Design an enzyme around this catalytic site. Structure first.
Site, PDB file in Angstrom:
ATOM      1  N   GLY A   1      15.598   1.160  -2.533  1.00  0.00           N
ATOM      2  CA  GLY A   1      15.029  -0.076  -3.038  1.00  0.00           C
ATOM      3  C   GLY A   1      16.076  -1.119  -3.378  1.00  0.00           C
TER       4      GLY A   1
ATOM      5  N   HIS B   1      23.894   5.626   1.161  1.00  0.00           N
ATOM      6  CA  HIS B   1      23.819   4.363   1.895  1.00  0.00           C
ATOM      7  C   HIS B   1      24.424   3.203   1.103  1.00  0.00           C
ATOM      8  CE1 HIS B   1      21.403   0.819   3.593  1.00  0.00           C
ATOM      9  NE2 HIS B   1      22.190   1.217   4.580  1.00  0.00           N
TER      10      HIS B   1
ATOM     11  N   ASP C   1      24.013   1.986   8.269  1.00  0.00           N
ATOM     12  CA  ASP C   1      22.570   1.865   8.450  1.00  0.00           C
ATOM     13  C   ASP C   1      22.018   2.987   9.319  1.00  0.00           C
ATOM     14  OD1 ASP C   1      22.483  -0.367   6.855  1.00  0.00           O
ATOM     15  OD2 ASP C   1      22.318  -1.811   8.512  1.00  0.00           O
TER      16      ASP C   1
HETATM   17 CL   LIG Z   1      20.589  -2.792  -4.958  1.00  0.00          CL
END
Ligand SMILES: [Cl-]
Ligand SMILES: [Cl-]
Ligand SMILES: [Zn+2]
Ligand SMILES: [Zn+2]
Ligand SMILES: [Zn+2]
Lengths: 121, 121
Positions: free
Chosen positions: A29, A47, A89
């Site tokens: 998020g 990530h 990614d």
């Molecule tokens: Cl963030």
């Protein structure tokens, strides 16, 4: 950028990226990082830490080239920072697919996740 | 923050904000990006552009004070950035309500990877 990222996540997971990973656990998020709730959440943690090592290019805005050959993500980008960005990614998209087995909707949220502190990247 | 924004949207539109606007079209929600698909989507586009002008506060986490008086949103913050953040959220709530007539439930979970590139703010 967010275009390439969301696309990879769709391609790998088969999931609507915003709906499944736009507010999941502590790291999936836009509310920074936190101690991972599960395997999916940890993918997002790795990530974001991956973004932190990047030199000067903008992970949210900067576009880059990649291919989808034999249903595999291939980072063809020549620009070094963008290449690392693409690999960042690609890695989360693969990680999320790899962990659909333990994906739990209970870790989704609307306002904010209840999180402990994340280890420094 | 998301708390204030959600409550505003409920108050203006009457809809559950997460369900109806959390991922609507190309611009509404997390990872919201690209060319607007309709008037509702454009509200969200404008909202994100409004957020970009904000100086020194977090639209996602920072709380602020507003009143709902005679069914009117009234921002009540001395802090300039919080006041501006409140006016961004007020404006999107109003915009969403004003365009309920063309709201399209099918767009609720539009695949954002399908979106076209957005004009700069
Ligand atoms: Cl963030
Ligand atoms: Cl997405
Ligand atoms: Zn809710
Ligand atoms: Zn918004
Ligand atoms: Zn669609």
């Amino acid at each position: 950028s967010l275009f390439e990222l969301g696309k990879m996540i769709l391609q790998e997971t088969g999931k609507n990226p915003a709906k499944s990973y736009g507010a999941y656990g502590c790291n999936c998020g836009v509310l920074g990082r936190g101690k991972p709730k599960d395997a999916t959440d940890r993918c997002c943690y790795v990530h974001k830490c991956c973004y932190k090592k990047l030199t000067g290019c903008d992970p949210k805005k900067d576009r880059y080239s990649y291919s989808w050959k034999d249903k595999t993500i291939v980072c063809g980008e020549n620009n070094p920072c963008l290449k690392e960005l693409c690999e960042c990614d690609k890695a989360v998209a693969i990680c999320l697919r790899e962990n659909l087995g333990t994906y739990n909707k209970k870790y989704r949220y609307h306002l904010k996740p209840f999180c402990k502190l994340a280890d420094p990247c």
